């Protein structure tokens, strides 16, 4: 059984194993870091089954849960938030914060999203690139989702820049463990204090809604509110940063499609849909353990055996998406959903917010900077390490 996670075939490409497994052995066993075996599911139809089957559990203290690293094994010990819950606990807690992320709520946020993107682009323009390329990640891709989610949570404007840097330090590949866990503690301590404050004078933010509607009535206590706030911050931010940078890089690699977006910014939504299928930047979140024996394809998955469902592989599934390895924002979409945001009850709470952020970015960026160019040869883009989710560490641009 091969070791899993697999390595990406190159900087921007999924692991090569997935295409072979889809063709010859679509439900197979893999070996995890601790020697245990897990089932790997690779076809779109089977990923959807794993994401919705009531015989499968997300509870991480169940025997067989497929932790992929040593830190996940010990993180399993903490009191769970709704990301690690089964029904009915899952939606009981998820519904406490879902109101901010509905399509109606995200529609009302759209002027604020546009203003955030506008302001940060104008700052980048004023900084200029007269003294060399600027890092699109540091200058734009990082602050855009960071400022927005921090602001929704209730962080005051003056604290955004420091806290944006701390959260980046958490996930930066060159941070030592001491740097990353210090940045983590910094974030937790700040949120605890913000929860204390909002308990005394609520404002109009997510933390205030939790304090008023759930902590004070006694449905949760303030430490749960901290954990939930922390989950909403760290679950998708690094992914958002990577998607923005990957979109720029992808467009530099497909000049004809960038020219179409320049001449018709209304194609941004279609570009975003294809971006999220092609570059599946969160590919290791759909994991389960079997509560009962369950049959998947031609395999029997025994109770207490772990399952990993690759939505990255599903998004390249030849049986669903014609020419899946071509990036084509003009593709015709089948009836099946792309699975960039997962599937079923656990499907990304922030799907609509994420798409609205991405859509706002790519309908504005090249109107503001029509001559935006990646400043290094495309073969020299600094992608994330091949053993991690696809992403871009830094992206020097001129404009």
Nearest residue (CB) to ligand HEM, 39 versus 399? 39
Contacts of 339 (CB under 8 A, 6+ apart): 44, 47, 48, 51, 280, 311, 314, 315
Provide, rounded to whole angstroms, the least separation between the CB of residue 345 and ligand HEM: 7
Candidate list 282, 359, 360, 384, residue with the active-site label: 282
Work out whether strand 299-301 and strand 294-296 pair parallel, antiparallel, or are unpaired: antiparallel
Work out whether strand 37-41 and strand 306-309 pair parallel, antiparallel, or are unpaired: parallel
Nearest residue (CB) to ligand HEM, 21 versus 284? 284
Provide, rounded to whole angstroms, the least separation between the CB of residue 310 and ligand HEM: 11
Residue 384 a catalytic site member: no
Nearest residue (CB) to ligand HEM, 308 versus 374? 308
393 sits in which H/E element: strand 392-394
CA distance 11 to 391: 8
Candidate list 239, 250, 359, 384, residue with the active-site label: 239
Provide, rounded to whole angstroms, the least separation between the CB of residue 2 and ligand HEM: 23
Q: Taking Cα atoms as reference points, which of 389, 395, 290, 289 lies closest to residue 340?
A: 389
Candidate list 348, 359, 360, 384, residue with the active-site label: 348
Contacts of 164 (CB under 8 A, 6+ apart): 142, 143, 146, 147, 150
Nearest residue (CB) to ligand HEM, 129 versus 315? 315
Q: Map residue 374 onto helix, strand or coil.
A: strand
Provide, rounded to whole angstroms, the least separation between the CB of residue 314 and ligand HEM: 11
Provide, rounded to whole angstroms, the least separation between the CB of residue 370 and ligand HEM: 25
Nearest residue (CB) to ligand HEM, 129 versus 275? 275
Provide, rounded to whole angstroms, the least separation between the CB of residue 81 and ligand HEM: 8
Instruction: Confirm or deny that 276 is annotated as ligand binding.
Output: no
Structure letter (DSSP) for residue 307:
E
Nearest residue (CB) to ligand HEM, 321 versus 399? 321
| The two structure tokens encoding residue 374 | 């990646």
Provide, rounded to whole angstroms, the least separation between the CB of residue 24 and ligand HEM: 26
Residue 282 a catalytic site member: yes
Residue 239 a catalytic site member: yes
Q: What are phi and psi of 308, to 5 degrees?
A: -120, 125
- Where does this chain bind ligand HEM (CB under 6 A)? 51, 82-83, 94, 149, 231-232, 235-236, 239-240, 243, 276, 281-282, 285-286, 311, 340-344, 346-350, 353-354
Q: Taking Cα atoms as reference points, which of 226, 183, 189 lies closest to residue 78?
A: 226
Candidate list 86, 205, 317, 389, residue with the active-site label: 389
The CA-atom distances, in angstroms, between 267 and each of 110, 327, 340, 390, 399 are 17, 14, 19, 24, 22
56 sits in which H/E element: strand 56-57
CA distance 90 to 383: 35
Nearest residue (CB) to ligand HEM, 28 versus 227? 227
Q: What is the DSSP string of 154-221?
A: T--GGGHHHHHHHHHHHH-TT--HHHHHHHHHHHHHHHHHHHHHHHHS--SSHHHHHIIIIITTTSS-
Structure letter (DSSP) for residue 338:
P
Residue 276 a catalytic site member: no
Annotated binding-site residues read 348
Binding site, annotated residues for heme: 348
Catalytic residues: 239, 282, 348, 389
């Amino acid at each position: 059984a091969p070791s899993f996670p697999f390595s990406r075939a190159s900087g921007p490409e999924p692991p090569a194993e997935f295409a072979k497994l889809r063709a010859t052995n679509p439900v197979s066993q893999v070996k995890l870091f601790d020697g245990s075996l897990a089932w790997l599911v690779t076809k779109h139809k089977d990923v959807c089954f794993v994401a919705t089957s009531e015989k499968l559990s997300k509870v991480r203290t169940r025997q067989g849960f497929p932790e992929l690293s040593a830190s996940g094994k010990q993180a399993a010990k903490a009191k769970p938030t709704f990301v690690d819950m089964d029904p009915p606990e899952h939606m009981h807690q998820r519904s406490m914060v879902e109101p901010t992320f509905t399509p109606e709520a995200v529609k009302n946020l759209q002027p604020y999203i546009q203003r955030t993107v506008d302001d940060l682009l104008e700052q980048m323009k004023q900084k200029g690139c007269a003294n060399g390329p600027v890092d699109l990640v540091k200058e734009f891709a990082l602050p855009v989702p960071s400022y927005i989610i921090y602001t929704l949570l209730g962080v005051p404007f003056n604290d955004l820049e420091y806290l944006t840097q701390q959260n980046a330090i958490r996930t930066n590949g060159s941070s030592t463990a001491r740097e990353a866990s210090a940045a983590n503690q910094e974030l937790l301590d700040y949120l605890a204090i913000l929860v204390e404050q909002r308990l005394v004078e609520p404002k109009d933010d997510i933390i205030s809604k939790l304090c008023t509607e759930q902590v004070k009535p006694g449905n949760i206590d303030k430490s749960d509110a901290v954990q939930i706030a922390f989950l909403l911050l760290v679950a998708g931010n690094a992914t958002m940063v990577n998607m923005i940078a990957l979109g720029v890089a992808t467009l530099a690699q497909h000049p004809d499609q960038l020219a179409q977006l320049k001449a018709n910014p209304s194609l941004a939504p279609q570009f975003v849909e294809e971006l999220c299928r092609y570059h599946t930047a969160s590919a290791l979140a759909i994991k389960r353990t079997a509560k009962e024996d369950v049959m998947i394809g031609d395999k029997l998955v025994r109770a207490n055996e772990g399952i990993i469902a690759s939505n990255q592989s599903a998004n390249r599934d030849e049986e669903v998406f014609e020419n899946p390895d071509e990036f084509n924002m003009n593709r015709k979409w089948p009836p099946q959903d792309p699975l960039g945001f997962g599937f079923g009850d656990h499907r990304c709470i922030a799907e609509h917010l994420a798409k609205a952020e991405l859509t706002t970015v790519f309908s504005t960026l090249y109107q503001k900077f029509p001559d935006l160019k990646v400043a290094v040869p495309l073969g020299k883009i600094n992608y994330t390490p091949l053993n991690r989710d696809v992403g871009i560490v830094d992206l020097p641009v001129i404009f």
